[PDB]
Amino acid sequence: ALGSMFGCLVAGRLVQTAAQQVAEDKFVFDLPDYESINHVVVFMLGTIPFPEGMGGSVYFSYPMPVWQLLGFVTNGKPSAIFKISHPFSVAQIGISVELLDSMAQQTPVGNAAVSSVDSFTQFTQKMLDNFYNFASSFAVSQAQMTPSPSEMFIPANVVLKWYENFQRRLAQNPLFWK
Amino acid sequence: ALGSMFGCLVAGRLVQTAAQQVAEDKFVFDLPDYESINHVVVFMLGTIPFPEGMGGSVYFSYPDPVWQLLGFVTNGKPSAIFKISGLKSGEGSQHPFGAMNIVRTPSVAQIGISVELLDSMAQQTPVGNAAVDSFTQFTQKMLDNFYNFASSFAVSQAQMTPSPSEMFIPANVVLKWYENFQRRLAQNPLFW
């Protein structure tokens, strides 16, 4: 035939290349022992390119099976690493051949260091929620303040300002902190 | 002897399978444009297993002939991902690569694989931060970052500007929160 197009590698195991064809432009790798899957590496073998105007969207499913879009591979960027621990015990990697123009409009959650980029925002939101739920009881206005020229106060709006700064820095680079 | 036995992958690039064989048990991959690399993937091709009692030690060379040990690959664990950025120089075991002609430059790094006795590999020490907990670093940094930021706005009553619509939190309350959250994060990193 033409041969295999993709490799799928669970860190700690061997490369899988014999993907199961589930559609003319969709391919799936079954991954056993989902619990021991920390990282997956998905890549082009270099034998067959994506067709004109096309790239690959990489999805992951895990235990009922639930899917998430990890990211993309293209002729220009033919490999990607994803931390692990719609078009489609045992997990699956799915690759769907799609228009490059369409792939640009999607929002992948995958990342090489963290399972989901949403966890960054999720943690920050819960940290600030924990702070304000605690601090709110003690908040005072200047009119409510009792005379104490020496005591230090922090404006409540630092919550909002820091969150806004975090969002901006995260949008630039999801791993700015690392 | 073992032929092309290993593969090497940098994220965003094509897999390399053709290593320089500086000995019949020693394989070297060139990595051009090294400063734009954080992670490297090394793996057995699955063409042939390691011989009985043998495994692979994976080394890295960079600009300051000299290799830091990154880690290992074996028949039982035939692939691994390594961090090669931010490694502290001078650490870890020494290297077996005595090829006269390992042609080298500051922009071109190497990954070296030596087929070694498993017994010998068990006595080697990889450098720190090589093996790949990342989210733990994130949460700690964000906590410290937020507290330092919030604290930078701390003001006494005498230093305040009139702002009748603004609310203020006593600084000792913010500090108490910071200490408690730090402490609860270190016993249950997923408490939140």
A-B CB pairs within 8 A amount to 183
d(CA B150, CA B174): 8
**Which residues of B fall within a CB distance of 8 Å from A44?**
14
The structure was resolved to a resolution in Å of: 1.9
Interchain contact B1–A (C-beta under 8 A): no
B155–A150 CB contact, under 8 Å: no
Instruction: Identify how many contiguous H helices and E strands chain A contains and give both numbers.
Output: 3, 10
Query: Residue A128: which of A175, A160, A167 has the closest Cα?
Result: A160
Which helix H or strand E contains A159, and what residues bound it?
A: helix A158-172
Interchain contact B66–A (C-beta under 8 A): no
User: Could you write out the three-class secondary structure of chain B?
Assistant: CCCCCEEEEECCCCCECCCEEEECCEEEEEECCHHHCCEEEEEECCCCCCCCCEEEEEEEECCCCCCEEEEEECCCCCEEEEECCCCCCCCCCCCCCCCCCCCCECCEEEEEEEEEEHHHHCCCCCCCCCECCHHHHHHHHHHHHHHHHHHCCCEEHHHCCCCCCCCEEEHHHHHHHHHHHHHHHCCCCCCC
B41–A77 CB contact, under 8 Å: no
Q: Where are the domains of chain A?
A: 1-178
B150–A142 CB contact, under 8 Å: no
Whole-angstrom CA distances from B187 to A126, B49, B133, B181 are 17, 42, 14, 10
Method: X-ray
